[PDB]
């Protein structure tokens, strides 16, 4: 009467005849990315496909074991997946139409060129030119011509195309028991049956709206600053009490606000410390950047980097005409095979990258002792977070100091702290307000809270509202303003970025106390501790075996995200951030429209 055991075997095979298929499918990919040819492309077309084979069939022979009887969660989980037919279940002729859609849009966005608004010659392509045009000058016009150069254009191409996928995508879902694609998308966290550690698939929504309605106070004062420091470099334009229009903001769509440290600089008479120079002075070579990282980790007592790393990792540009893809990215072809592929260019914007892409490999080396179908991260954003905390302690006026790199001659003051923050708080607090909306909208649109013939309205509505931006020009219902950026047109859930920004500060303030902090927390530096060292491994080890809910408790100390810790990192700033406003205004006058004027 073994309903299980008659399956604890089904896994025992999978676990062996997969790894081998997966090794020879991730290998293929290195070889290409490393060496860019043609046969290589094909050489991966096979095994980069084969893997698929294995998969589908095993799913077939996975529902053959009604999960109901399984009780060892370990196996209730390794199975939870496999079964998941997800797509395929969807209609055939229809599954076709879907397969199609994606392509169209997912392609459009790619080559999308913008010819001059005053000549069929300046047809800037996004990658280089469209972008610059945005994060470059200051003059008006071209900023609008560009905010115009895409929305009612490179997205209209797909305006109804977005209206397309929303149809089938929701169909598939229904079947797989998921009101809306968003209910499918809102699942990586759904933890079922664990007593106390339980978590729903909707609870999330509320915890978000909570945590967010706590941030407003900060963010509010930041659009308060710029709003005026964007009334200096600008003439009669930004109404002093309304919304910072698009174009004149930062990037293109404007996820981050980083491209601005100039216009707003607390005391533009400070040093902005940069160890670049000194690197070029000690003659620091590439194989140094990595040996440094390795240490930081071994200092706090964590495994050294293996010998297959220092002997198989493309740690520089693509050799000769060896056309290579230059994207920093640590791999894990399995079987102890760990590798990194970054074209480290000597500087301090790559020395942090290392500490960021070695943490990926240091997590990937703890979960290495778990069933293949349970080697990942408790939830979506525990993977970045656990390797950004490193690019935080790395660039500490101390570390770089104590590391025989940064002139210990550090004349450290207040107008530098007050200043290193507007930087780390224009790209980690100005991105938050935007990560919400997008998600909300679709999480709704999907659920069907908006009818296409209105979709547009909401965007702009929830753009002067939650964020604080007005449409430079009025926009038409047939423009997919929302759907006009990689993620939107490449089906990618985008809340792994609001839950990674709030788990990083819950990890800093926790593995900080452990190493005896006591001052501005931005000043933390776990380097050389060992108490925090163990703190992490006791979570990096459980891979995906246990619920994320409890994974936190091991570390942090609770089991639900918290906006408190983050609101402490910049706590310093939130002082000079109210004394700098003093008598200026705060809050947006939703009405004022630079176009409705």
């Amino acid at each position: 009467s073994t309903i299980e055991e008659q399956a604890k075997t089904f896994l025992d095979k999978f676990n062996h005849e997969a790894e081998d298929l997966f090794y020879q499918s991730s290998l293929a990919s290195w070889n290409y990315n490393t060496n860019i040819t043609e046969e290589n492309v094909q050489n991966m077309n096979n095994a980069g496909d084969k893997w698929s084979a294995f998969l589908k069939e095993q799913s077939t022979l996975a529902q053959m074991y009604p999960l109901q009887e399984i009780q060892n969660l370990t196996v209730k989980l390794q199975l939870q997946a496999l079964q998941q037919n997800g797509s395929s279940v969807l209609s055939e002729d229809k599954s076709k139409r879907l397969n199609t859609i994606l392509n169209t849009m997912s392609t459009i966005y790619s080559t999308g060129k913008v010819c001059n608004p005053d000549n069929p010659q300046e047809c800037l392509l996004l990658e280089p030119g469209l972008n610059e045009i945005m994060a470059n000058s200051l003059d008006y016009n071209e900023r609008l011509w560009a905010w115009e150069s895409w929305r009612s254009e490179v997205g209209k191409q797909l305006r109804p195309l977005y209206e397309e996928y929303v149809v089938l995508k929701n169909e598939m879902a229904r079947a797989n028991h998921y009101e809306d694609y968003g209910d499918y998308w809102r699942g990586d966290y759904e933890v079922n049956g664990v007593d106390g550690y339980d978590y729903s698939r909707g609870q999330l929504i509320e915890d978000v709206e909570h945590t967010f309605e706590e941030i407003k106070p900060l963010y509010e004062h930041l659009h308060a600053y710029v709003r005026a420091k964007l009334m200096n470099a600008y003439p009669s334009y930004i109404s002093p009490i309304g919304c910072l229009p698009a174009h004149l903001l930062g990037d293109m769509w404007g996820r981050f606000w980083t491209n601005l440290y100039s216009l707003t600089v607390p005391f533009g008479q400070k040093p902005n410390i940069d160890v670049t120079d000194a690197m070029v002075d000690q003659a620091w070579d590439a194989q140094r950047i990595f040996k440094e990282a390795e240490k930081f980790f071994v200092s706090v007592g964590l495994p050294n980097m293996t010998q297959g790393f220092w002997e198989n990792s493309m740690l520089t540009d693509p050799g000769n005409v060896q056309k290579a893809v230059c994207h920093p990215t640590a791999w894990d072809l399995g079987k102890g095979d760990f590798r990194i592929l970054m074209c480290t260019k000597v500087t301090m914007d790559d020395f942090l990258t290392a500490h960021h892409e070695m943490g990926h490999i240091q997590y990937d080396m703890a979960y290495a002792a778990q069933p293949f179908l349970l080697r990942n991260g408790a939830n979506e954003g525990f993977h970045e977070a656990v390797g950004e905390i490193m690019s935080l302690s790395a660039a500490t006026p101390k570390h770089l100091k104590s590391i025989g790199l940064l002139s210990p001659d550090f004349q450290e003051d207040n107008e530098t702290e007050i200043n290193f923050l507007l930087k780390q708080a224009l790209t980690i607090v100005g991105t938050l307000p935007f990560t919400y909306m997008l998600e909300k909208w679709r999480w709704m649109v999907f659920k069907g809270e908006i009818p296409k013939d209105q979709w547009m309205k909401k965007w702009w509505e929830m753009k002067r509202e939650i964020v604080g931006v007005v449409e430079p020009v009025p926009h038409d219902e047939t423009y997919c303003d929302p759907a006009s950026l990689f993620h939107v047109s490449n089906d990618y859930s985008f809340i792994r970025y609001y839950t990674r920004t709030l788990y990083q500060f819950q990890f800093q303030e926790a593995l900080c106390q452990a190493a005896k902090h006591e001052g501005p927390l931005h000043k933390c530096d776990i380097s050389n501790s060992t108490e925090a060292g163990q703190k992490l491994f006791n979570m990096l080890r459980l891979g995906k075996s246990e619920p994320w809910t409890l994974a936190l408790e091991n570390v942090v100390g609770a089991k639900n995200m918290n906006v408190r810790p983050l609101l402490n990192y910049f706590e310093p700033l939130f002082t000079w951030l109210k004394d700098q406003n003093k008598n200026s205004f705060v809050g947006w006058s939703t009405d004022w429209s630079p176009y409705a004027d």
Binding site: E5, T9, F10, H16, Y23, N312
Partner: protein, 196 residues
């Protein structure tokens, strides 16, 4: 002695017998088994230790046994497409009495199903280790030689090499020519000890 004529033999745990005196004493006779295995399993092979290697593929007892010797063999054993030659038995039926052996392919079954099994699985015990050269040092191929000595009723014949000292002649010297003992001056001679 020429046992040290191996590399840093990744192991040599002499459970049971004093590792030393290895050549100092003798036992009835000694067998030497051998096989190829990944390095993430070179410990299962040890008195008491459990797992797959010791479960359907080679279970020692607890008796001294003698020792064990392990060396990485990737260099020559591994390949670049998958040395899919060495095999193992993922599942038998129960286990093996210390030093048993089973080679019957016997496609695994059991389950009283049309194909007695664990859900259309009807798995087959033999799987292929399939090594490659880029793997970790835990999935790379190690070689093992299990040393099984024993002291039955008859002697330790096999026994081992003993050293000399060179002859002296014309000086009290104690002795052990062959196995006869005594103390005396070993001068020349004049006898004709017949050829035997």
């Amino acid at each position: 002695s020429v046992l040290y004529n191996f590399a840093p033999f990744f192991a040599f745990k002499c459970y049971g017998v004093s590792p030393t005196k290895l050549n100092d004493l003798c036992f009835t006779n000694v067998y030497a088994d051998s096989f190829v295995i990944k390095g993430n399993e070179v410990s299962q092979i040890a008195p008491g230790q459990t797992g797959n290697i010791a479960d359907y593929n080679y279970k020692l007892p607890d008796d001294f046994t003698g020792c064990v010797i392990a060396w990485n063999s990737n260099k020559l054993d591994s390949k670049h497409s998958g040395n899919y030659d060495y095999w193992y038995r993922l599942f038998r039926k129960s286990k093996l009495k210390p030093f048993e052996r089973d080679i019957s392919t016997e496609i695994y079954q059991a389950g009283n199903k049309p194909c007695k099994g664990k859900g259309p699985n009807c798995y087959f015990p033999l799987q292929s280790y399939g090594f490659r050269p880029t793997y970790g040092v835990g999935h790379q191929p190690y070689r093992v030689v299990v040393l099984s000595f024993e002291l039955l009723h008859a002697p330790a014949t096999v026994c081992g090499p003993k050293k000399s000292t060179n002859l002296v002649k014309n000086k009290c010297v104690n002795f052990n020519f062959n196995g006869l003992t005594g103390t005396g001056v070993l001068t020349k001679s004049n006898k004709k000890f017949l050829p035997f």
